[PDB]
Structure formats: structure tokens, C-alpha cells
């Protein structure tokens, strides 16, 4: 309860303290324990191949220069004291843009311990790149990682470990992605060697499974309905040249518009997606239907009923093969 | 292991140190070695004629004022010590917007050496302008460069060189552009003379080859299908005036929509691209097909079969000439 005594203790700790030197400089590497409390994953972008992550990033390490005696309490100091203390140069290797929230003050926590242990917490919103394999899109499964590494200190000066083992990362259940579900998360610790030296690495990875519900309503169902619409021409008499030709034209044009719109919502990848294959297949059926009437019109100047039993049967077989392959 | 001894050594180095003066001020120019470890090339924009580059920029130079003895170690100091040290005024000449990542601290590394050598590393995300020749688009090849130059110090005060020769730039294989492939990269060192004086220059250039896979599915294939769709009118009887006229109208209108959409995704260049030539050629065929029926309708109040053998033959010849010219 003696604020002056606490003030003297803290001033003694910071007297002669050199922020430029890591703890145990020139000696054994300092072990830094890390925990992450995930707040939310706001966005997952296929076009930019990145995701936005908000989390509470906490670092644990012991600095004997900050050890104090006579106070059986954990000193929770103002966040502005972190500028006078050494902190690990932790950075995210795969991030594209990140910041620390600063309202109403910087989202930062410093909590000292009698033995010299320092707890350093930060609330960070980060946009991390995540390369995606869209070959099976929209029935694909993605593995997005978050790489944690020291920038300047090599393994000879600093070491990273997940504090608490597999329980180091919490809040995974808080992730509520409308388009994805968190199948699994993993924690990986390893050493990465560059030209400048070997650096510690912590990796946090999520396996995301895309939800097919949106794409059934948005793309798959409209494509099927247009294909069924083309089948109406078979029951229309052949003398109705204007009617059957108009039916063939509009179904083909509508199919093209759907195909063009979908590809504009995704990155300009050179390979063919699963959804593209379905749209190409649907375009073939409607195009064949218009060609079917042209053949009927040509011979006229039994075929229709024969065509009535082939296209729905073939389209059902095409759907069965397509869904079994991608599920 | 004597932190106090190291603290005294570093304090001695910075005592009387003048950041305003370059090493060997008034004498021989200081040689600065540079290496780049490319992290990723996030975006390549044709509309803005620029690309986004993330890299680890490292500078090597010797400052005898920072030489220390008695410590057989490389001092990896906190990144905040860089504010008390002289650093080269390196800037990127062709960049449009750049920043240094600062989470959880500034992505900066300072590593001293006993002989006075200083290693200065920065993780920089930069948007560099790259003029593009879109005459052969989308079958074009682009050469995007990254110019590195000193802003204030001339060649009499500073010199640049690629540390490691042709191996100075690494991580080129990490570049994963969905639309481009890295054919080759080159390193160029030269001197550039301005009014204020002659300045050292380092240039890093990439040759990018665009992938045609996306454009075949998005633009080329839909255009061909519409052109084939116009050929259906030939097999339809001439008395079906509504049917054949509707076929000609819709194919022409669809061709215009595709042409308009493509040009909106590219900068308003005044010259004609390769893809524009193909769209213009496809528009001619569909327009001629509608004119063909008008001639048939006019004479009526053999031509169709004669037209059946000309347009597919001419269109195949047009495609053969087009692809051979641009490949």
C-alpha cells in the first residue's frame, strides 16, 4: 500500500536499464513463451488470398534485471512503461498489414513478477496472406497459417515455445465465418535458417472447410433451372420456329451471363475450378438443345421424343458423376 | 556474459557519435552492400501499372566509429538503436507508396561486428510503378524494375553494390503470381547523373510472362461460341424471318457486351490490343451473318449452303492467322 515504496522499487529497476541489450546478453538464449487468444476472423478473401485476424498476442519471458523483492504482488504497470523495457522483436512473417489498437489507449499490457517474469500482451488486428488452391472450389478445403518469428535475434539469442503446449491458442470456437468452418488447428515449432542465420519459428494453422449452402442457391440451382428450361423446347411443336429458337437463344445467353459473373468474383487463376466444369457442362447441354432443333428444322424442310429421353438422362448422369467426383 | 561490460562498450561507441556525418566524412566514399530476400509479389495491376512487393531489404557497410574490441561476438542490438546510428539514405526511385511493418515492433534489425561492419535489415512492402506494353495483351511479356538509389549522397560520398554478385537477390522462387510467371531476373549496377550530381543506382528487374489459361476461358471461348451460334441461322429456313433475325441480333448484342466488359478492366490506352483485334474480328463475322440473311431475304422477296462453307472456313483461317501472329 506504500506507493512511494513501490515507486522507489520501480525506479531502482529502471535505473541503469539498457533497452538496447536483451536479457542475458552474450549468454544463453532467452526463452519466450507465447499464447494467442483469438478474438475473431473478420474476412477471408479469395481474390486477395488473405484473411483478417484479431487476437490477443501475449509474450512470456524472464528478465532478472526487473526482479524485485519485498513486494508479494504482481505489478500491473501502465502500458507506457513498455517503452522503457526490452521486448522481443516478434513479427509475423506472412502478414500483409497489421496494427495495434490504440483506443482509448494502446491495447498493451505489462505485468511484472517478483522473479523477473514479464507478461507482455497486445491486441493486434492482422491481415495475413494465405495461398488458396481453388481447383476444387467451391468444394475446397484451405489451410491458412500464421507464421511467428523473431526478426533480429537468432536462435543463439532467443527461443520460442508455445506456453501451455497444445492449449497455447484459445478462442478458436469464437471464429464465426459465414462461408467457412474451422475443422482443425495445429501448433508447430521449428527453426528456419536464412542467410543471416537460424531463427526460431512458431506457426499457427487452421484448416477451413467451405460451406456449399451459399453456392447451391447462388450458382448451382440457377444453372440447373436454365438447363431444365431448355428442355421445354422439345415439347413445343417444330412449326413454332420463333418460339423454339428464342428458347434456345435465351437459355444460352443466360448461361453465359452466369458463367461470366462467377469468374469475376475470383482471382484470375489459369486452372479450371470445379464450378467452372459444371458451368461448362451446363452450357454444352443448352447449346446441344439449340443444335437439336436446327437439325430437326433442317430435315423437316420422333427425333424430339428421342431427345426428350436423352438430355434429362444424360444431365442426371453428368450431375451424378460431377458430385461423386468432388464429394 | 558481462552485461555491464557490454553496456560500457556500447555507451563508449555512441559517446560523441554524430549521426549527421557519414562514415569517413570528407574522405573516400563508403561502400554499401545490398541484398534482397523477396517475400512475395502480392498484386500486379494493369490499370494502375504498378506491382506490390514485400521483401527483406538488408544493407551492409563498415563504420570504424562503431568498431569494438574485447568482445568476440556479433552484437545483435535492439532495433531502437538505429535512431542513434548513421544509416544510408536509400530510397526507391520508382515506388508509389511504401512502408515498414511495425508489429509487434518495427521490422528492423541492427547487428554490429567487431571490425565496425553494420548489418541493417528492413521488411518493406512497396508499390512500385511499372509501365506495361499492352499491344500484345493478353499474350504480352512485361519487364518490371525496382530502382534503388541514394537520395542525398552522390557517388563521391557513397557507393552501391550487390553483395554476393548475382546471388544478392533471393526468394524469386517464392513469387506465386496466379496470372504471371517469373521468366528471369537481373541485377544492374550503374551511375545516374542529375543536375545535383551523379548518384549510385541499383536496379532489380523481373520479366513476367502472362498466363493465357484465364483469358481462354473468360474471353476467347465465349467469343468463339457466340460466333458458332451465329452459324445456326444458316441451317434454319429462310421463311422463319423472326427466328433468323433474332439469332443475328442476339449474337451481335452479346458480342458487344463482351467487348465492352473487357475494355473496362484495362487502362484507357489509345492503341489496339491483341484481344481487341480478336473481338473485332468476331464482331465482323456475326455482323456479316446477319447481313447475309438480309441479302437472302431481299432477293427472295443455294446462298445459305454457300455461306455454310465460307464462314467456318474463313473463321478458322482468321483464328490460324491470329494465333500464329501472336505466338
Amino acid at each position: 500500500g506504500n506507493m512511494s515504496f513501490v515507486k522507489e522499487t520501480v525506479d531502482k529497476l529502471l535505473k541503469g536499464y539498457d533497452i538496447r541489450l536483451r536479457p542475458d546478453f552474450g549468454g544463453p538464449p532467452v526463452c519466450v513463451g507465447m499464447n494467442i487468444d483469438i478474438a475473431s476472423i473478420d474476412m477471408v478473401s479469395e481474390v486477395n488470398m488473405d484473411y483478417t485476424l484479431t487476437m490477443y498476442f501475449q509474450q512470456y519471458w524472464r528478465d532478472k534485471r526487473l526482479a524485485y523483492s519485498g513486494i508479494p504482488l504482481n505489478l500491473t504497470l501502465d502500458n507506457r512503461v513498455a517503452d522503457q523495457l526490452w521486448v522481443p522483436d516478434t513479427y509475423f512473417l506472412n502478414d500483409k498489414k497489421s496494427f495495434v489498437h490504440g483506443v482509448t489507449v494502446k491495447n498493451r499490457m505489462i505485468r511484472l513478477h517478483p522473479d523477473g517474469t514479464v507478461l507482455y500482451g497486445l491486441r493486434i488486428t492482422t491481415t495475413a496472406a494465405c495461398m488458396m488452391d481453388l481447383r476444387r472450389y467451391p468444394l475446397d478445403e484451405q489451410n491458412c497459417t500464421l507464421e511467428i518469428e523473431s526478426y533480429g535475434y537468432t536462435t543463439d539469442d532467443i527461443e520460442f515455445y508455445w506456453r501451455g503446449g497444445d492449449k497455447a491458442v484459445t478462442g478458436v470456437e469464437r471464429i464465426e465465418l459465414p462461408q467457412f468452418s474451422i475443422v482443425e488447428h495445429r501448433l508447430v515449432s521449428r527453426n528456419v535458417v536464412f542467410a543471416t542465420g537460424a531463427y526460431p519459428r512458431l506457426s499457427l494453422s487452421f484448416r477451413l472447410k467451405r460451406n456449399i449452402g451459399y453456392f447451391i442457391l447462388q450458382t448451382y440451382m440457377p444453372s440447373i433451372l436454365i438447363t431444365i428450361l431448355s428442355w421445354v423446347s422439345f415439347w413445343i411443336n417444330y412449326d413454332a420456329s420463333a418460339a423454339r429458337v428464342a428458347l434456345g437463344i435465351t437459355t444460352v445467353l443466360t448461361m453465359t451471363t452466369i458463367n461470366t459473373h462467377l469468374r469475376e468474383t475470383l482471382p484470375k487463376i489459369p486452372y479450371v475450378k470445379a464450378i467452372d466444369m459444371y458451368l461448362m457442362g451446363c452450357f454444352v447441354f443448352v447449346f446441344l438443345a439449340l443444335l437439336e432443333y436446327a437439325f430437326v428444322n433442317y430435315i423437316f424442310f420422333a427425333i424430339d421424343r428421342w431427345s426428350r429421353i436423352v438430355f434429362p438422362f444424360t444431365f442426371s448422369l453428368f450431375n451424378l458423376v460431377y458430385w461423386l467426383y468432388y464429394v | 556474459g558481462n552485461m555491464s561490460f557490454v553496456k560500457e562498450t556500447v555507451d563508449k561507441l555512441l559517446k560523441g557519435y554524430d549521426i549527421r556525418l557519414r562514415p569517413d566524412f570528407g574522405g573516400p566514399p563508403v561502400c554499401v552492400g545490398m541484398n534482397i530476400d523477396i517475400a512475395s509479389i502480392d498484386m500486379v495491376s494493369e490499370v494502375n501499372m504498378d506491382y506490390t512487393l514485400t521483401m527483406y531489404f538488408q544493407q551492409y557497410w563498415r563504420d570504424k566509429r562503431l568498431a569494438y574490441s574485447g568482445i568476440p561476438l556479433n552484437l545483435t542490438l535492439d532495433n531502437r538503436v538505429a535512431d542513434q546510428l548513421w544509416v544510408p539514405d536509400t530510397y526507391f526511385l520508382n515506388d508509389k507508396k511504401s512502408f515498414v511493418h511495425g508489429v509487434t515492433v518495427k521490422n528492423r534489425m541492427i547487428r554490429l561486428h567487431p571490425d565496425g561492419t553494420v548489418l541493417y535489415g528492413l521488411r518493406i512492402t512497396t508499390t512500385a510503378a511499372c509501365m506495361m506494353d499492352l499491344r500484345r495483351y493478353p499474350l504480352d511479356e512485361q519487364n518490371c524494375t525496382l530502382e534503388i538509389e541514394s537520395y542525398g549522397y552522390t557517388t563521391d560520398d557513397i557507393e552501391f553494390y550487390w553483395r554476393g554478385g548475382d546471388k544478392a537477390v533471393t526468394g524469386v522462387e517464392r513469387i506465386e503470381l496466379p496470372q504471371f510467371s517469373i521468366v528471369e531476373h537481373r541485377l544492374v549496377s550503374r551511375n545516374v547523373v542529375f543536375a545535383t550530381g551523379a548518384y549510385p543506382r541499383l536496379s532489380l528487374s523481373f520479366r513476367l510472362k502472362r498466363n493465357i489459361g484465364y483469358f481462354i476461358l473468360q474471353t476467347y471461348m465465349p467469343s468463339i461460341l457466340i460466333t458458332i451460334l451465329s452459324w445456326v441461322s444458316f441451317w434454319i429456313n429462310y421463311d422463319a424471318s423472326a427466328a433468323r433475325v433474332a439469332l443475328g441480333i442476339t449474337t451481335v448484342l452479346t458480342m458487344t457486351t463482351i467487348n465492352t466488359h473487357l475494355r473496362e478492366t484495362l487502362p484507357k490506352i489509345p492503341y489496339v490490343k491483341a484481344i481487341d483485334m480478336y473481338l473485332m474480328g468476331c464482331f465482323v463475322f456475326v455482323f456479316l451473318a446477319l447481313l447475309e440473311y438480309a441479302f437472302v431475304n431481299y432477293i427472295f422477296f443455294a446462298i445459305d449452303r454457300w455461306s455454310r462453307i465460307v464462314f467456318p472456313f474463313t473463321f478458322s483461317l482468321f483464328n490460324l492467322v491470329y494465333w500464329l501472329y501472336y505466338v
Epitope: 495461398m131 488452391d133 489451410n143 | 517469373i182
Partner: nanobody, 121 residues
Amino acid sequence: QVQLVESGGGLVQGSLRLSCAASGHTFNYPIMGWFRQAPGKEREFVGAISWSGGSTSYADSVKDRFTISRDNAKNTVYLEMNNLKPEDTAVYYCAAKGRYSGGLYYPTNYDYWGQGTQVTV
């Protein structure tokens, strides 16, 4: 999870073409590397190539002599060893590297390795 099998070694006195077939989650490991280990000497980097784009790198010793290329249809990476020398007597391995696993020249950055073929000239 990537499985690597390499073949095409043997003993010669010439041009030789090694090969390495990959299977599994190759998307997460877009970089394939070639390494050789002389008896007693540390494992040496030979060359690396990306699955997509065909970007390649080589060591100075094997520069302008060895060529590396891959075909994605067979998921195979092949090392063409031409103008062989007696110094090129080592066990040749095939390895795959993660996207953010670091530099190419360091074998410890690679996760999955092949069996290794012994080549003696």
C-alpha cells in the same frame, strides 16, 4: 504429407537423368530441392525448382552442367546430369520445402525427403 521416390541412378564412366516423383499435399510444398551427400562431407545443395512457374536455382559447382525441370502431369521433378565429373560422386536425395520454410540452400528447411540414390563415376 508428401511422399518422394527417386530413380535413375546407377554407375557410369556421360549424360544421366535422375527423376523424383511426388505424391500427396504438393500444394503446401511448392518447392522441390535436390541434395547430394559425399561420404564424410555434409549434405550439399544441388538445385531447386518450383512446381508452378518453373523458376529454378542452381549451385555454382553444378551451374551450366545440371538442368532441372518438372512436369505437373506426373508430379515428377527430374535432374539431368550432363558432363559428369569424378567430384559428382554422392548420394542424391529429393526434398520438398514449405511455402514459408526459408532459404533453398539449407537442407534443414525441407520437411520430406526421398530415399537417396548412390551415383559413382
